[PDB]
Amino acid sequence: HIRIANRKRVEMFVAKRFHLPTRLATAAPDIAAEWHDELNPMHMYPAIIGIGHVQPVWWKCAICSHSYQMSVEKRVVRGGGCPQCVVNGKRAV
Amino acid sequence: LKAGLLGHYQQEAFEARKRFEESTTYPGPIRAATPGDTRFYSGSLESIL
Amino acid sequence: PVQKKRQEQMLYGVNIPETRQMKFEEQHPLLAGALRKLEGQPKGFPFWYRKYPTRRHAYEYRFSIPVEMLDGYNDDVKKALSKGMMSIQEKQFAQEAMYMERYAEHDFDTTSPAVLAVKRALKCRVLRNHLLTNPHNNIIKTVLANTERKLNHALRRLRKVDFKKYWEIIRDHDVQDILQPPNLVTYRQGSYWKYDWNAGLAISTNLADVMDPR
Amino acid sequence: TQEKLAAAIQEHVQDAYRFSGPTPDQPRNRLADPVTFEDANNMIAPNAPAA
Amino acid sequence: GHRLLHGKREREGSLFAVANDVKRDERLLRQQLNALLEEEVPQTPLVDLPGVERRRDLPADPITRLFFQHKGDHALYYGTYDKP
Amino acid sequence: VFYSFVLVMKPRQRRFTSQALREIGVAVYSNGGLIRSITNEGIMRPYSRFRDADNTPLTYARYIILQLDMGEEEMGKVDKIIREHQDVLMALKLNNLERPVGIRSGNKELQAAYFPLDTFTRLEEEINWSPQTSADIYTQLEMNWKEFSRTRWSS
Amino acid sequence: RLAAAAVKAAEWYAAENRRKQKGGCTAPLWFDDTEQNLLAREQHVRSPAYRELHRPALTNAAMGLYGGEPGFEKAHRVWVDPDRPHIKHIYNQTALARNLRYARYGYFKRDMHLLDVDKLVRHARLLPTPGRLLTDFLYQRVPLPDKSCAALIRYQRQQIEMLEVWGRHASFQCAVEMFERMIVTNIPPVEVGVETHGEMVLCAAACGKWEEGWNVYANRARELEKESPESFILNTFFFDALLTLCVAAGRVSEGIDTLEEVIKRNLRPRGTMLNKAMILYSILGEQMSKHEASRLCEPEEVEKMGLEVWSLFDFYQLPRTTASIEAYMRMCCAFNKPTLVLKAQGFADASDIRLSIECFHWLVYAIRGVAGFGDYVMDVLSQLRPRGLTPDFVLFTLSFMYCALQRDGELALAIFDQHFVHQNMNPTPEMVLLFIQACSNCEEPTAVMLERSETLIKRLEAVGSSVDLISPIYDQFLELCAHLGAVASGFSALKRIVGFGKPLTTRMINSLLLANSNAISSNGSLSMTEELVGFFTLLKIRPNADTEICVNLCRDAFGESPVVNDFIKVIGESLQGDSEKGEAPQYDEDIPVIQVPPHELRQLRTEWKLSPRDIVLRRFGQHTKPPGKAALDVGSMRGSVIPFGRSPGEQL
RNA sequence: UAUACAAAAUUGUUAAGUGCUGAUUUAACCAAUAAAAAUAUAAAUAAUUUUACCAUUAGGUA
Ligand SMILES: [Zn+2]
C-alpha cells in the first residue's frame, strides 16, 4: 500500500503495474502542461488523474487563449486538440 | 423410515383427526357407490378363461 | 454478548435499569450526560407510545426515533435523522424489521418460522456480499456455510408447516430451486425425502383444506 | 479447441504409454542409435564445411 | 387458520422472549412471571413445597401427599438446580 | 457527532485556503450531508511535517476541525476528495464518536450498556475535552454566571 | 411514429437488397444481429475437433479385455463443455472421483491462454475480484479481445447488481478503473469494443448514474463508431444497454430515440428492448395522468405509440414473454384501457404464457374505475390457485381498492370471508382502510360488516405497522357505525382513539351524532345527544354544517332538550357568521381513496440476490469442518459387543 | 492346521518505515462476522468443500 504522490492510497502491485506510469503529469508532460488551474476542481490535477479519465475536464490552450471541455482519454489516447486551434487551421489552410 | 417417531406421529395423527371431526364435522350423509374391480390381485397371473 | 446486542437492537430500553443509570453512566458520568439550559418543557408524556412497542415498528429514522418525537425540531435535525444517515447496522435492521412486520405473529414475535427463514436468507446475503469484495476470509466462508445450512433447515421446516408463506417468499425473491437435492446418488435412495419424516414433519398438511382425502 | 484437443490426445497417449511399465535408463537409448549430427542435418540441406 | 405447533418447545408454548433465539433457557423467566401472577381481600399465598397441576397427580402415599400441594399452574417451572 | 475530521494543511494564502474550504463544503452539501461546525485552529508548530504537493520537510501547518453528518456511501466520496486535495497535507477522520472507544476491550458488561444518543447529540468538543475547558466551566454555564461575575476584578 | 419508421425501414432495406442483387429472391426486411453468432456456435459445436474432444468415455470393451493391463484398465480422460454437457451430473461426490475441487480458478490459470473468459466467469470456484482477475490476465500477458473485456466487465456488473444499494459506488469505481486499465494497456493486445462499452453502460444503469453513463460511455462508443467505419458497429446489445439505462434513470425521450434509431438502422429489435419501450411509454402515461390530475405529447398520440409498439412486437416476429405481458398491461393501465388489458390477458393465456402475479395485479388495477366486475375479481382470485400462484397483500389491497371505489361492500365482505381468512397473513393499514371504506360507503350495510371491521382492526393492532392510518381508519369505522346504528361501538372506539393519543375530529363527532339519530331501535336518546354535543364546547372543536344536520336529525328522532336547542341556535349563528366571513358553508370533506399503481404500494421486501446453483456448487469456497476420528473409530472387534463392555469397571 | 475372544480472531481499511519492481515490517480507529429446525434416543440427527556496499546469511566496510 503506497500513496501516489503521497495523495492517492493504492495497492503496491496495482500501483507498480498501472497507476504510476499512467499519470497525466508523468506520462504526458506536454499534455498536462495545458491543465486548467481555475475551472478544474482543486481535488483533480494531473498528478493523480490518469490517462484514461473519461469524464471531461477543462483544458486551457497553450497556442491560443481558449478554455474548453475535453476528456483526458480523448485528449491523450484517441487524440484531441483545441477546437479553436483546429477551426483556425481549417480557416487558414 | 425411522421407527422412533411412531409414537409422536400417532399423537399428531390423533390430534389432526380430532380437529377435523370437531371443525369440518360431517355435512350430511353421502350415498354409497358400488365398488368396482381391482386389477391388482395377489399371486400368479390367472388364465383368461 | 451477542444476545445482549440483539436484545438491545430489538427492544427500546432493556439496557436502562430501574435506577435509570447504566453501568457506563456509573463509571463515566461526564461522557454519559451534559448540562443543557433549555428545560424539557415541550416533552411531556408520550401519548403515542401504543404504536411503538419495539424498535421494528420505527425503522424510518435513526436510532428508531418515532416521527412524533420530532415536532419542535428543525428540518436540519430531521435531515440528520433521516434515512440517508442511517448506518449499515441500522439499514440491516430496517430490512429485517420490514420482513418481521410482513411475517410477524404479534408485536414481540421474532421467532416465527417465516421470520427465521428471512433472517437466515438476509444473513446469507450479507455474508456473500462481504465475500464478494473479500474473497480471502476463511472464517467468513465457514460462517456462510453454516448460515446456508441453517437457512436450508428453516426453509424446509417453513415449507412443511406453512406452505403459503414459503411459496410467497419463494415467488417474491425468485429463489425457486433454493431447496434442491445435492446428489442424485443419495436422492434416488430417498434420503432427501426421509428428512421430512426424521424431522417430525411427515404428516402435517391438512389434506382436507388443499385436496380431497377420499 | 484445436490445441486443447491436441493436449488431451497427448495425455491419452501418456496414459497408454503407462502400459510399457518403467522406462529403461539412458545407455540403452544411447547405444540404440549410432546416428550423427551430419546424417541428422543432411536431410534438409547440406551445410558447407567451416572455413 | 390452523397453526402447526412443531417441536416440544412450541407444544409447551415457550415465549421465545429472547430475540431471534429459540434454544435459550426460559424456566427462570416463566417462574418469575408465575411469581408475579401470584396474589399478595383474603389472598392466601402458595407454599414452597413442590406441587402438581392436577389434583389427581397427588401421590397415592398419604405421607408423601403431605409434601405436595395442589397448585393450578404455578406448580410448573419448579427447581433451583439447572442442567449440568 | 456522526463524523469528525481534523485537516492539517499547508498555510497558503487566504484566498487559496478559502477556496479549498469552499470546495469541501460544496462537496459535503452536494453529497446530501450536513456540517455541524467548521472551525479554524490557526497556524501551529507541529513536531514533524512533510508536505506532499511541494515535498518540503518544514514544520508549519494550519489545523481545521470539521464536523459532518453524512452516510457511509457519501462519506467515502468526501474522504476521497479530502485526501486527494493537494492542499490537505494530512486528514484524520474520527468515526469513533457515536460509540465510546474500546468498550468491548474494557468489559463485556459495558459492551451493550451505552446510549449512543448522548454522544450523537453532543458536539465534538464535549466528546473530546480541550485542555483549557473544564467541568467547572460547564457548571458555571447553569449557575447564572452573569449576575455573579461582577466582582471578578474587585481586588 | 414507430410503425411508420418500421415500414419505412423495411421498404428501404428491401430497395437496397433489390439494388444490390441487380448490381451483383426473398430477403428479410430487417437484419438479425444474433443469427451470425448462433451460426458460428453451431458450426463450432458441429466441427470434428469439438466432437472428438467432447466424447463419451470409452467402454470396457473399447478399452480392452477384462482388466489388469496398466493404461487400459480405466476409461481415459473425459472433457465436458459446461454450457452444453454431453453427460448429466457433471460433478459428483464420490470418494476417488471428486471433481468439484478441480473446477477452481487455479487450475484454469495453466490454460488461461486458451481460456474463454465468459465460460470461466460463469463456471469457476473461488474466483478473485474482477480487478485481480484482469491483473492476472495482464500479468500472464494474453491478448484479451472484446469478448474477454466484456466478460470481465460483466463479472464486475454482476458483482455490482449483487451488492446493496448503498454499496454500489465502490464497485462502479472499480469498474471504471478496470475500463481505464483496458484502454491504456497497449501490450498485450487489448481491444475495447462495442460489447465492452455496452457492458459499461449496463454497470452505470445498475449503479444508477445516468449522467456518468449516457454522456460518457455511450458517447465514447458512438465516437468510436464514427471514427472507425464498420470496425465499431453497434449491435442490438449496445442499444439494449442504452434502453436499460433509460429505464433505470426514468428517461423516456432518450429511450424512444434509441428505439427509433434501432428501427431506422434496419435491424430487428429485441423482446427485452420492446418491453423496455412499453415500460417507458407507461412511465410517460403515468406522468401525463399526474399532470392532468394537477390540472406535452397528446394522450391519444402516446396511446397510439403504445399500440404501434405492441404491433411491432409481432411485426418483427418477436415472441412475447411474461415480462412483455407485464409491460403491456402496465402501459394499458397507464393509458386507461381495461378492455385491452383483458384482451392481453386472454391472448397470453391462449397459446403459452405463464402469467405472473404482477399480471393479475395489473388486471385488478385496470378495472378500478369500472363497475360490474366483482364476479370477475372473484373468479380471478379463484383461478389463482390452479395456476400455481397465491394471492398476496398487494393483490388484496388492489381488490379492496376496487371494492372501495365501487362502494359495493358485499364483494369485499365475500372476498374477506372466502379468500383472506384462509391466508392467515398480517393485514396492512391500507388494506384495512380500504375494506372499511367499502363496507361503509356500500348501500344497506350489515352487522357482519361491523364484525369484520372490528376483527380486522384488532388483528392490525395486534400485528405491527410502520405507516400511520389510524385516524382515517377510525373515522371510516365511525362512519360505518353511523350508517349501521352501532352507537355503542362508535362510543367505544373513542377509547381506542384516546389510547392511540389521536385527537378527535368534527367528522367523528358528526358520525356519532348520525349514529345516535339512526339508532332509534337499539339504543340512544336525549342523554346521548347531550353527551355528544358537550364535546364541541369542551374540546374546542369547530362545528360544521354536517354537524347541524346531524343534530337536527337527532332532535327530530328523540325530542327537544333545552341544551340541544341552545346549541342549535348558537351553531346556526356561528354558521351564519362563517358564511358572512367567507362565501360557502364548510362541510366534512370525504376521505380520499388510494388509487396508486401496484408498483408503488410499499412493497415489504427489499431484495434477495441469492443463487441456489452457487450454493450447491459451493462457489466462494464454503467450509463445513467435518468430523475426524470420531466417526471412523469403531473399537476392537476381537469379540462380540456385550452389555457393560468386555471389562465392566476398572480400578487403577 | 482350526479353537482357547493375545471476536486480545480473520479480511479489508489507514499511518509510518526499511527496500528500491515483485517486495516489505509494526501499530491504530472503523466496517463485517459469536446465539438462533425437529429428537437424545433418533442406531447412520453428519459433510464431500476450505487454508547501503562487500563478505557469508549476521561479520565487516561505508
Ligand atoms: Zn487553441
Side-chain angles (χ1 to χ4, degrees), chain G residues 151-278:
Chain G
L152 294 184
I153 299 303
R154 191 183 306 108
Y155 182 31
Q156 180 65 83
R157 191 258 300 188
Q158 293 176 7
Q159 180 169 342
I160 294 180
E161 61 189 10
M162 281 181 180
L163 283 190
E164 302 278 358
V165 179
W166 45 89
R168 307 286 181 85
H169 190 78
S171 294
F172 186 74
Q173 297 309 316
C174 294
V176 309
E177 292 300 325
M178 294 178 61
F179 196 68
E180 268 71 296
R181 295 184 59 188
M182 291 178 175
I183 290 180
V184 307
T185 36
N186 68 322
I187 176 82
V190 173
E191 51 168 346
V192 172
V194 42
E195 196 178 358
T196 305
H197 282 266
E199 281 295 337
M200 283 303 302
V201 174
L202 286 175
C203 300
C207 185
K209 300 185 174 303
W210 163 267
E211 282 73 11
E212 294 84 332
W214 173 270
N215 300 316
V216 171
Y217 293 91
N219 186 24
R220 190 179 193 276
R222 292 168 177 174
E223 182 183 352
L224 262 302
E225 181 194 17
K226 68 175 60 63
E227 167 267 345
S228 57
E230 101 93 6
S231 181
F232 205 88
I233 48 182
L234 299 184
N235 313 121
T236 56
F237 165 75
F238 179 75
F239 294 100
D240 200 319
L242 295 185
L243 273 175
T244 308
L245 178 55
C246 294
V247 171
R251 294 295 200 278
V252 47
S253 175
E254 287 76 10
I256 294 178
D257 295 3
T258 51
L259 181 68
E260 192 174 356
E261 170 177 346
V262 178
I263 296 297
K264 188 160 58 183
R265 289 196 177 186
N266 297 258
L267 77 170
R268 70 185 302 188
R270 293 182 173 178
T272 64
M273 301 176 55
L274 297 184
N275 303 347
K276 293 160 179 56
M278 288 184 294

Side-chain angles (χ1 to χ4, degrees), chain C residues 162-174:
Chain C
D162 193 340
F163 181 76
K164 323 292 290 303
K165 297 188 177 183
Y166 163 81
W167 194 254
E168 172 187 355
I169 290 179
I170 291 314
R171 169 162 41 88
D172 286 331
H173 304 85
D174 295 354

Side-chain angles (χ1 to χ4, degrees), chain G residues 98 101 104 125 618 622 624 646:
Chain G
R98 319 175 186 273
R101 179 173 176 82
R104 50 196 304 186
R125 302 181 58 254
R618 313 189 71 99
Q622 290 79 1
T624 48
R646 306 185 64 83

Side-chain angles (χ1 to χ4, degrees), chain C residues 10 39 44 58 67 83 126 128 140 145 149 163 166 168 188:
Chain C
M10 181 54 188
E39 304 173 356
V67 55
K83 304 177 56 60
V126 172
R128 182 254 308 172
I140 295 303
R149 294 304 176 272
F163 181 76
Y166 163 81
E168 172 187 355
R188 71 195 304 271

Side-chain angles (χ1 to χ4, degrees), chain F residues 38-131:
Chain F
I38 165 66
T39 53
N40 174 25
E41 312 284 352
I43 297 176
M44 289 176 48
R45 21 100 276 261
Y47 289 82
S48 180
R49 261 283 81 83
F50 175 57
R51 281 90 244 269
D52 312 332
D54 298 7
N55 312 319
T56 59
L58 59 94
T59 66
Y60 246 97
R62 181 197 300 273
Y63 288 82
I64 273 180
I65 300 299
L66 184 71
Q67 305 185 22
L68 306 177
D69 298 329
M70 312 188 60
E72 295 87 352
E73 184 86 326
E74 301 82 4
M75 199 59 188
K77 322 173 184 179
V78 175
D79 188 13
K80 273 303 299 174
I81 288 182
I82 295 180
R83 281 187 280 101
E84 301 312 317
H85 200 137
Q86 58 175 12
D87 210 334
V88 180
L89 269 54
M90 177 55 60
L92 182 133
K93 169 185 172 183
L94 300 86
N95 43 20
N96 50 262
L97 301 183
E98 302 182 3
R99 183 181 61 173
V101 278
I103 43 101
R104 355 161 298 183
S105 182
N107 187 18
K108 295 183 179 179
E109 299 185 0
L110 299 183
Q111 289 178 7
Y114 73 98
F115 201 49
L117 273 181
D118 320 66
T119 60
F120 185 69
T121 51
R122 289 196 309 270
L123 291 167
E124 213 283 330
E125 299 80 29
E126 290 76 8
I127 298 183
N128 298 331
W129 289 11
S130 303

